[model samples]
Target chain A: MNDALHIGLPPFLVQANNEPRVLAAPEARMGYVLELVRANIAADGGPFAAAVFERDSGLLIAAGTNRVVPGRCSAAHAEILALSLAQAKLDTHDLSADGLPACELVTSAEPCVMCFGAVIWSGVRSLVCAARSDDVEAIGFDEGPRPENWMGGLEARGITVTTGLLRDAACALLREYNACNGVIYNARC
Target chain B: GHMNDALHIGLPPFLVQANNEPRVLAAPEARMGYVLELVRANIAADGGPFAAAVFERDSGLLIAAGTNRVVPGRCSAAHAEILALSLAQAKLDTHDLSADGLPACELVTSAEPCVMCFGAVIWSGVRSLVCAARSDDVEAIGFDEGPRPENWMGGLEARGITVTTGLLRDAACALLREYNAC
Candidate 1:
């Protein structure tokens, strides 16, 4: 009953939905990134969290990390970092259809601006993470020139990065990793 | 390796666990494009019957060998068949498309049916016509020219129709094992 027809034009929603195309094949590229990052930290006796931000659909793919390298916190650090990265990927791109770009950006790292060429080349706006891996470490450092803070590099990339704390952060990290990326799910010919 | 110990002898490890996946019973229309692609690949890959000419009947579009294979996906065969036979069948219940069409009333066949598959076509009520040729290979121990009740189309009728014989015999083997032997 809510559907409406317009004279000589597609209805409001139809026109609104005519966005750039995404491939129909089944792919969980972003999901794999989250699983891999969490597993890597767990195997290292650290806690981490990872998140994916899809610019157009306002979709957030997030997970909690448990333990990490010595000084930093586990769960909270991850949540903060993940939120920051998700927000940055969103801010750099226009989410609406009219705001869409003529092509897609391809980045070597998560939300890399270097990917602007592919985005411009293909004129596709449905941003998807093909795959990624990350490490989480939490050590409060003075705001200045410091070589040891690798997390700063992620922040420079505009992905909010952080650390977390969970019950037995190291064990939690291991258990979480085992549950997720440990087994490959869905497949095809 | 012995058959008992040949770990790779079976199906390719495409998917680790298929049976545990979600149920796959959606309406066929939902996957029409994907299915059509797979069917086309099979036709190109030396697996199914195909033809070069368009077969036709009085007032009916000639359905060919390629047409039959298209049913596994591609084109609108059922849509055409439905328009023709919807009211004729009294039993209005079978979801399977094969059960409802006019019994044995084939759409025009585009090519000659394979000699091996002639029985299946005639059993479905189609008449066959074509050019005939028998295999001359040594393994062809028995090649005869006769039409049985089940031969939907004769080999001669298949003359104008084309065939893709990708699944043919291997080359001569006797004393031919040398790497560069002519």
Candidate 2:
């Protein structure tokens, strides 16, 4: 069974015709994911969205949105869910194993500490993000204790990391969620 | 949907029953002891040599129990601590375990959380963390442990999450040795 089933995909992600099957351009991938953030916030979710894709083929494998608030599962961050779903879809925990397509995790924002560990254990070969942890914290969300060399941590392990592909647009979407007074769940007391 | 379409997480059915059977273990040592049992089961089943459970802090009511299902669950984030913490949140009907009206909770684990799990612990909203083994015990066995903050205990304390380590450390270390050697 797929770990993806434990956490249901958002309606926007499950759509067959909603997005192109392949997103070859980094800007296009970021453009496609910019909408995911707003759509998730519109659905009463956090201002986060992520998808896992076949790296070389650019084929979208799985999509996810932050569901912690609604699902009551603290680990239901978008990046974690997308990685797990894509792994389940392929029936392997390590995405980089031989004979499989190298995968990329494309997200609307940078991963927090927990998600950073998850990204490593996930076996995805590449990570792409539009916003930074600072952008997330600006709106009162906690990115946890991601190290100063967190980017280097991933790269040293062969998981290429990229950022700021669509920085302004992604941050603007986060601001939109703040304007709506969306609840920012942080580390609890 | 095919098997690839869905992955079953949470407790295996047997563990679900075992957790409820405990109902409550008022003694802290009893909590760690039970977590060790789950860890042993994990190793026996060829899973990771780790286990964790969430409990109602004061009463020690077992909310959820889980071992390493990362490989079986086909999700790298499926560490034992993550499963129990998230499942406890799910069972308690809130993402923030510290939500008002819910009792304070504790996460009891077989080993100190690695960097990833350390972060999961803070976000879990648990009031206390009880551990049996240190992370070095894990790395000693070739487990892919991550670099946690130097003062990881203090990090949790900074977040208001308490920490207790070395409860049954000898037995926990023995288990890790056995699992990896197997």
Candidate 3:
């Protein structure tokens, strides 16, 4: 450790506002996630956000928005932030336990490559999505070369991944952000 | 617990730079030398082609440093500048360092940040930037820097962030060349 620098530990953050939006079923929960994401975009937030909840009780655990641009932090992706907060709330390092979780994750788009690993490591039992990776890629951001069996890989590890809830509306959100000329930051030749 | 174990199982020890590299504790000339060493150590530490650091401009204390982890992590969005800024923000959030903004910070990079990192620098509330080489230097090595500097620099200045360039240019350019050759 140079006097000029302090090598710190890895970084993470968790923010939760426990105003539970109880949904009776998965469809209702999916709609709520869409509502939250639309509000995020309208408020000049990132085109994405995610929520975590108790799968059985439908009690909201936490939610996070994509603040990469605003917050200047890439780890501020909605899904990561939401999971960070959930982990904080539960006081557990892993979201999965003994091949089960008391919770689920709902994301606006499929988890990008970073968040995909995060979801697996998080140990959440169920993963739900509104938009497909293709929808995000169509807008010019390379979602990375996630394998075709990425979802299958998650299930093999005990995390159930689902997609296509409110698909058109989610794609519409992506189109809106794309048309608005938001910055698409990809680093490739 | 399981995730923490997964993360720690393969983690490598943190590292600094070579003795031949320059060191800085104050302002003016120090920023360039300091950032140069950051890029150097980043390559050495992570074996990534690029690296960067964020510092408290007033004190010149290194807040954090980062290197390219996208390929290994399979997260293409992760870049040196993005990782550095994210780590710095996490530090601030963890410690309650700043509330209104990170006006006290400066970002110095081995190369001009790609468009994605440029957006991160602006939105992450940093107000000062220093670069060792131009984005073209990176692109010449076969990487796409996305939009050009002139397109984004203006927007950054318009938002009140100060920009400086050409610090340790030859050395950074040499590193890019080495990576290209490899």
Candidate 4:
């Protein structure tokens, strides 16, 4: 409200002809997580697939024989999702406080360090999940050198690691599968 | 629909002070709540700030920390969310007054006033305000570069444009709702 200094900015424009490629990191992350969730369900020989949000990112749930959940960017609904779920957990009484979704699932796409930090802060035990294959290509990351060690950041952050989809080329298969499913895949991040 | 695109905006190298706390809000994800507060305050004193919107995420511009304003509300969450949403969808440049047959005051946010938004504001043929975030890490995020500039807002700023964040988050939207409800 500083009229003396609150100078407004000029208008911003985007050339329609330019049509630059727009990538959604959250989408990419969601694909990878979803693949793992679906694959784990098939592997476990069951049918269970759902997506949840912690803070604007997706956390998928694949409850087959082996349970797995992936994280996604919850986008604009993060706050609402967080508060709603948190309130729901508050209403639960049978389970002890430890069983709540402080760190519901461990298979998030962002830095595991941040994920684990959220877990510790929220006081939830994270579940694990993995992709079906390596075709899963994450945006904003280098193409070469699979991100096997990337989760190390999360582990170092004192978060536990669970295996949802641990097959090689798991990330890639996810990309291909999601593309075929009319997922509106954006440019590589 | 998509809130992840603008969080952690890139800042330019020029406007930033090395190793300083980000001049902007702590988290780009948290900017909406902050802006809602600032915008409400502006309305309290002055009459109106022009409204604007950006369809594409890339259209966002660089915003300076010191210049950006945050508003406070004393209404309902739904009202605040609607006001913020109206602002998010408001046309660039032209002012959308709550009393002038508009029923509410709002500024639609799209890309920063880099090209399209800036032009629209100009074309709207009215005096407007532009709140932007810097691409420079020092200017945008306000944290010291962690041995790598590419990872921070410094990297995003290189893309060019002004940006206003926090409009997309649901929690931020709820905060506005709470304000409006009051």
For each candidate in turn, the TM-score is 0.17, 0.92, 0.52, 0.32
What are the per-residue Cα lDDT tens digits for candidate 3 across B21-134? 333456745666665655555566555577777778788777766666544433344467756676677666532223456547887777777655665665566778888888
| Model 4 Cα lDDT, one tens digit per residue, B42-156 | 3343212211221222222212121112121111011112222222223222232222432222223311222212222222212223232222312232311112212222222
Worst 10 residues of 1 chain A by lDDT: A1-10
The runs of at least 3 residues in candidate 4 whose Cα sits more than 4 Å from the true structure, single-residue gaps closed, are A1-88, A91-103, A106-123, A132-135, A138-153, A163-189, B1-151, B158-182
Output the TM-score of candidate 3: 0.52
**lDDT (C-alpha, whole model) for all candidates:** 0.25, 0.81, 0.64, 0.27
- State residue B182's C-alpha deviation in candidate 4, in Å: 20
**A1-189: candidate 4 lDDT, tens digit per residue:** 111111111111011101232223434434444543445433321122222233223333111111211111111121112221232334421112444444343232222221222223332333344532123234222122212453463365454555534433345444443444435766651
lDDT by residue for model 3 (A26-50), tens: 7787777777777767655678878
User: Alpha-carbon error at B47 in model 4, in Å?
Assistant: 25
Looking at model 3 chain A, report the run of 10 residues with the lowest lDDT sum: A3-12
Better of 2 and 4 by DockQ: 2
As a TM-score, model 2 comes out at 0.92
Docking model 2 quality class: acceptable
- What candidate 1 gets wrong by more than 4 Å, as runs, is A1-30, A42-48, A55-71, A74-77, A88-189, B1-182
Indicate the docking level reached by candidate 1.
incorrect
Q: Which pairs in model 2 have colliding backbones?
A: A1-B6, A1-B7, A2-B6, A2-B7, A3-B7
Which model scores highest in DockQ?
2
Best by TM-score: 2
Candidate 1 vs candidate 2: the TM-score winner is 2
The DockQ of each candidate is: 0.01, 0.45, 0.05, 0.03
lDDT of 2 by residue, B70-166 (tens): 8876678889888888778767778889998889999999998877898888888899999999877888888876755568798889989999999
RMSD of 3: 12.0
Task: Say which prediction, candidate 3 or candidate 4, comes out ahead on TM-score.
Answer: 3
DockQ of 1: 0.01
